[PDB]
Amino acid sequence: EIPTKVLTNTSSQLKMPVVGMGSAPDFTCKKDTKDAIIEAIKQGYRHFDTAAAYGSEQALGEALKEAIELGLVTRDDLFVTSKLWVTENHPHLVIPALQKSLKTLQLDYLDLYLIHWPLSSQPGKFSFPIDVADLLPFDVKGVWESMEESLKLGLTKAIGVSNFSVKKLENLLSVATVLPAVNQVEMNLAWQQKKLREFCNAHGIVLTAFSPVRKGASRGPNEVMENDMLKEIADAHGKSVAQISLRWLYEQGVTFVPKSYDKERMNQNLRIFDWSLTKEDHEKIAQIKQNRLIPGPTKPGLNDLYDD
Numbered sequence: 001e002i003p004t005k006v007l008t009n010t011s012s013q014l015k016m017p018v019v020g021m022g023s024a025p026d027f028t029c030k031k032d033t034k035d036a037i038i039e040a041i042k043q044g045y046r047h048f049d050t051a052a053a054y055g056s057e058q059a060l061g062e063a064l065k066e067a068i069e070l071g072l073v074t075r076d077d078l079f080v081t082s083k084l085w086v087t088e089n090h091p092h093l094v095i096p097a098l099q100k101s102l103k104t105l106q107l108d109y110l111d112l113y114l115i116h117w118p119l120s121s122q123p124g125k126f127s128f129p130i131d132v133a134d135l136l137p138f139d140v141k142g143v144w145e146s147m148e149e150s151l152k153l154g155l156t157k158a159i160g161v162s163n164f165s166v167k168k169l170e171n172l173l174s175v176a177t178v179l180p181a182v183n184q185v186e187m188n189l190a191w192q193q194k195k196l197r198e199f200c201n202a203h204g205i206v207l208t209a210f211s212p213v214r215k216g217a218s219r220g221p222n223e224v225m226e227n228d229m230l231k232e233i234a235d236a237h238g239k240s241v242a243q244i245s246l247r248w249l250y251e252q253g254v255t256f257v258p259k260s261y262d263k264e265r266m267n268q269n270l271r272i273f274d275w276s277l278t279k280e281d282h283e284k285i286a287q288i289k290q291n292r293l294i295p296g297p298t299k300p301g302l303n304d305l306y307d308d
């Protein structure tokens with residue numbers, strides 16, 4: 001069985017499958033999203049991660065709906081996460097945005113809803129990347145109050161954030177009634193987020209790693225897949241570097257949402273629970289040179305976005 005992790009900051013101690021299926025745009029992918037999700041469900045996947053900005057909510061929803069109709073799974077068995085985009089990251093636009101995501105997904109409620117970025121921009125139109133001139137002041141307190149309201153309305157079972165630094169989390173905590181249940185940030189062998197991870201643990205905030213395999217080969221040379229030391233570790237275990245990566249993340253106590261629409265690869269991402277890394281493996285991995293893969297959604301980039 002796929003392990004779950006309790007979302008400490010939720011009153012009901014919701015259980016989130018430690019590994020989930022991602023759905024962000026894959027530059028080199030022409031696979032059928034809906035068909036891929038159905039296959040994932042048949043394989044054991046129950047945790048699905050999406051966002052209004054991915055363009056995948058529609059297909060994901062069609063897949064869940066069909067899967068439920070065919071009796072492959074029940075809504076209660078699923079854990080669905082979506083996110084509030086930067087353009088709607090304004091106090092009074094939060095609920096409408098969540099209602100729109102729910103309509104698109106053909107769902108009555110989300111298991112988790114996250115503020116996608118600690119940024120706000122011109123409302124009413126999705127534009128990517130975001131032109132810095134279209135940015136607007138982000139009212140954290142006001143937006144979070146609306147996320148909290150979403151819980152009371154039952155539109156989502158839990159609320160959290162994404163791409164929030166320790167500094168920004170500290171600010172959020174100072175004005176939050178309901179503490180964020182999750183913080184989804186980039187986390188892979190080349191970007192371990194040690195400090196952030198410790199802070200989150202100290203505050204009951206569960207971490208979810210996005211781009212856990214640094215987007216595979218969709219963006220050219222993969223720093224992790226090309227790491228000789230990692231290749232040796234994988235070779236020693238008779239596993240792939242991707243598997244070594246996901247196992248490490250699991251052992252670090254975080255959750256992760258690798259995206260794979262390949263029947264074989266998506267299954268390999270689940271086969272990480274009957275074996276483990278060695279003390280030496282951890283010592284080696286702790287030595288990997290760090291490099292952040294995802295800079296931010298704006299053009300140009302914001303050098304202080306992650307407060308680091």
Ligand SMILES: NC(=O)c1ccc[n+]([C@@H]2O[C@H](COP(=O)([O-])OP(=O)(O)OC[C@H]3O[C@@H](n4cnc5c(N)ncnc54)[C@H](OP(=O)(O)O)[C@@H]3O)[C@@H](O)[C@H]2O)c1
Binds near residue numbers: 029216257265
């Ligand atoms: N909140 C945010 O700001 C944010 C940002 C980015 C991503 N995400 C989340 O992460 C997911 C999107 O993907 P990603 O950016 O995270 O990248 P990723 O999972 O690190 O990498 C995905 C790429 O790796 C390939 N792959 C998957 N398993 C593999 C394996 N075992 N061996 C080799 N290649 C493998 C995939 O398919 P192919 O090899 O078949 O192409 C794909 O091209 C979504 O859930 C999304 O929500 C969130």
